[PDB]
Amino acid sequence: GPSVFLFPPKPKDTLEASRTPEVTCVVVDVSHEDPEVKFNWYVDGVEVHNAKTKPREEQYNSTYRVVSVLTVLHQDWLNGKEYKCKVSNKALPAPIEKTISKAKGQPREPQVYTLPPSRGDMTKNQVQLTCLVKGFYPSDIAVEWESNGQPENNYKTTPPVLDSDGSFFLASKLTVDKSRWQQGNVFSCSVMHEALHNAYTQKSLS
Amino acid sequence: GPSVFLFPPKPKDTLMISRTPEVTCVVVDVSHEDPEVKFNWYVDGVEVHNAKTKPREEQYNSTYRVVSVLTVLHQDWLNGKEYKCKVSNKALPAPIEKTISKAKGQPREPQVSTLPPSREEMTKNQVSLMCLVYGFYPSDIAVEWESNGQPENNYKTTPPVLDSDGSFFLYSVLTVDKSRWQQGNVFSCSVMHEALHNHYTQKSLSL
Amino acid sequence: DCAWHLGELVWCT
Numbered sequence: 225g226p227s228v229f230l231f232p233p234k235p236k237d238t239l240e241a242s243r244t245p246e247v248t249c250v251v252v253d254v255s256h257e258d259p260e261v262k263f264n265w266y267v268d269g270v271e272v273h274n275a276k277t278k279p280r281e282e283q284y285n286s287t288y289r290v291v292s293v294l295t296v297l298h299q300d301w302l303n304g305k306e307y308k309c310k311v312s313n314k315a316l317p318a319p320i321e322k323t324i325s326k327a328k329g330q331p332r333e334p335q336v337y338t339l340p341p342s343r344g345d346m347t348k349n350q351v352q353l354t355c356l357v358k359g360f361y362p363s364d365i366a367v368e369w370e371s372n373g374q375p376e377n378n379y380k381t382t383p384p385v386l387d388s389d390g391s392f393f394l395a396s397k398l399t400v401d402k403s404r405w406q407q408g409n410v411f412s413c414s415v416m417h418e419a420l421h422n423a424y425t426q427k428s429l430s
Numbered sequence: 431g432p433s434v435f436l437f438p439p440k441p442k443d444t445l446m447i448s449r450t451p452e453v454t455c456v457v458v459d460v461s462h463e464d465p466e467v468k469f470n471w472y473v474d475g476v477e478v479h480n481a482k483t484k485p486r487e488e489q490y491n492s493t494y495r496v497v498s499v500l501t502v503l504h505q506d507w508l509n510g511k512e513y514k515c516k517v518s519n520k521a522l523p524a525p526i527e528k529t530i531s532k533a534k535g536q537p538r539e540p541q542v543s544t545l546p547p548s549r550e551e552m553t554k555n556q557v558s559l560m561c562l563v564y565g566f567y568p569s570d571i572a573v574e575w576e577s578n579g580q581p582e583n584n585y586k587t588t589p590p591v592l593d594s595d596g597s598f599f600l601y602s603v604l605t606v607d608k609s610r611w612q613q614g615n616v617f618s619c620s621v622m623h624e625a626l627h628n629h630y631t632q633k634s635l636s637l
Numbered sequence: 638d639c640a641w642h643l644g645e646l647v648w649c650t
């Protein structure tokens with residue numbers, strides 16, 4: 225029968241007051257002969273009623289993809305509230321329940337450090353700028369680069385790696401033209417994380 | 431019926447001439463009613479006969495795990511020969527054939543750069559040394575740390591990330607007690623990759 | 638020449 229996948233909100237959306245965080249209950253392999261799906265949502269056991277169903281989408285393999293979305297408050301999610309989606313379809317013996325929440329454990333502040341390019345790597349058209357983010361928990365984070373108010377697009381970020389102390393670390397690498405770095409331009413590494421002061425920090429290098 | 435998974439050899443095994451690389455054909459979900467598995471191996475479509483079957487392993491979930499291992503030459507793998515494992519078993523409607531080889535692409539030389547700890551990290555009991563390895567292709571690599579001949583085990587290495595130029599990069603972080611760094615000890619990042627001279631380089635770091 | 642790693646042969650050309 226149908227399968228169920230329940231997704232968290234994006235870290236950025238939980239960490240910015242302006243943004244709207246949502247938990248998404250995706251039901252695939254819904255049959256043409258029974259597309260009707262009852263969703264019941266529960267927040268830490270208590271049933272809630274403010275969920276909206278996305279428009280139904282046919283998949284081309286003659287099954288429907290039905291999606292239900294629940295808006296969540298920032299605090300609630302960050303306070304470790306569990307969200308349960310109960311999916312009930314007639315092609316089921318019993319309903320499918322799924323639960324998600326933030327990862328369990330004491331949150332820990334990221335340590336953010338900027339590292340200038342190597343001296344032995346200066347005979348190249350472009351230089352590599354480094355932002356090390358270590359000592360953070362949970363792994364939910366966002367990392368970006370900017371310069372003089374403008375966002376820099378030529379960067380890549382590693383996914384978080386579990387450290388031997390039980391926190392995570394990552395590195396973000398910005399690639400820029402050598403002349404730009406030469407000219408004394410300032411580049412900034414911006415980090416967003418629940419355990420930062422105002423969920424935000426910034427470090428710069430030149 | 432059974433399923434097949436074909437595993438490459440470890441980058442270290444392929445990059446060190448004093449090691450022995452092998453490709454591994456694992457067959458899982460082999461039934462108690464039909465345990466017999468016929469293996470045929472091919473190297474660039476040419477059959478080879480020097481594979482060896484590992485001891486049959488009971489999994490305690492109704493099935494067997496059956497593994498055939500094929501020794502391969504370093505240069506064959508690195509030259510990009512394709513290895514094919516074909517698996518036949520009575521519970522199979524048709525034989526299952528898998529194939530692996532080194533990823534296709536003109537190999538590229540990793541640039542290895544060392545990065546001293548941030549002055550702002552000098553508040554903690556331990557500091558972080560970085561080895562940035564960028565611009566390599568393929569993603570098969572080995573990164574390790576040493577000091578005074580002895581290997582340093584207190585490090586973590588990111589997985590390779592696809593960069594905008596279609597090469598890979600990674601960071602390796604060695605964490606040491608601050609005192610060791612303060613005292614002027616030398617730490618080395620060792621990288622092994624097919625596109626380095628003799629598949630090996632090393633960069634050093636001290637205050 | 639040849640490359641070594643912790644007293645073990647890597648490669649020679």
Ligand SMILES: *[C@@H]1O[C@H](CO[C@@H]2O[C@@H](C)[C@@H](O)[C@@H](O)[C@@H]2O)[C@@H](O[C@@H]2O[C@H](CO)[C@@H](O[C@@H]3O[C@H](CO[C@H]4O[C@H](CO)[C@@H](O)[C@H](O)[C@@H]4O[C@@H]4O[C@H](CO)[C@@H](O[C@@H]5O[C@H](CO)[C@H](O)[C@H](O)[C@H]5O)[C@H](O)[C@H]4NC(C)=O)[C@@H](O)[C@H](O[C@H]4O[C@H](CO)[C@@H](O)[C@H](O)[C@@H]4O)[C@@H]3O)[C@H](O)[C@H]2NC(C)=O)[C@H](O)[C@H]1NC(C)=O
Pocket residue numbers: 227229231232233234237245246247248250252253283285287289
């Ligand atoms: C008929 O076809 C359908 C449709 O499939 C598509 O079409 C086919 C032909 C192919 O082209 C496919 O590649 C297409 O997807 C089949 O449906 C698929 O079934 C799969 C399994 O049955 C299922 O795999 C599971 O995926 C999970 C992760 O899914 C992510 O990422 C993938 C890849 O990037 C993406 O395809 C998915 O859509 C999904 O993407 C996320 O969507 C969520 C929900 O919206 C996003 O979160 C929200 O986003 C909004 C923005 O609108 C907003 O930001 C909100 O804040 C936020 O909540 C999220 O951002 C998206 N992520 C990305 C990266 O884009 C895996 O977790 C899961 O693995 C788990 O299950 C297994 C066992 O437990 C284990 O392997 C594993 O350990 C995990 O536990 C599954 O692998 C596919 O997702 C699903 N396709 C779709 C589109 O949903 C169907 O199977 C087929 N019918 C039949 C009968 O086979």
Ligand SMILES: *[C@@H]1O[C@H](CO[C@@H]2O[C@@H](C)[C@@H](O)[C@@H](O)[C@@H]2O)[C@@H](O[C@@H]2O[C@H](CO)[C@@H](O[C@@H]3O[C@H](CO[C@H]4O[C@H](CO)[C@@H](O)[C@H](O)[C@@H]4O[C@@H]4O[C@H](CO)[C@@H](O[C@@H]5O[C@H](CO)[C@H](O)[C@H](O)[C@H]5O)[C@H](O)[C@H]4NC(C)=O)[C@@H](O)[C@H](O[C@H]4O[C@H](CO)[C@@H](O)[C@H](O)[C@@H]4O)[C@@H]3O)[C@H](O)[C@H]2NC(C)=O)[C@H](O)[C@H]1NC(C)=O
Pocket residue numbers: 433435437438439440443451452453454456458459489491492493495
């Ligand atoms: C009965 O149980 C068995 C056994 O399962 C174990 O026991 C059970 C009870 C549980 O406790 C499990 O936790 C245990 O695993 C079941 O068999 C399993 O079936 C799975 C599929 O159904 C299969 O998943 C596939 O795994 C691939 C990767 O497997 C790796 O990694 C896992 C751990 O993550 C490891 O357990 C596996 O054995 C295997 O490990 C690698 O082995 C190779 C070869 O030995 C190693 O390579 C060699 O290394 C040596 C040195 O040691 C030397 O250098 C050689 O030269 C070199 O070749 C390698 O080092 C090992 N890796 C690691 C990390 O340790 C995935 O690729 C694959 O994914 C792909 O396919 C999926 C779809 O099927 C897709 O989702 C995906 O996109 C990919 O395309 C699968 O996930 C399990 O591996 C397998 N377990 C074992 C032990 O074989 C069996 O199914 C079950 N039966 C029933 C009826 O339930």
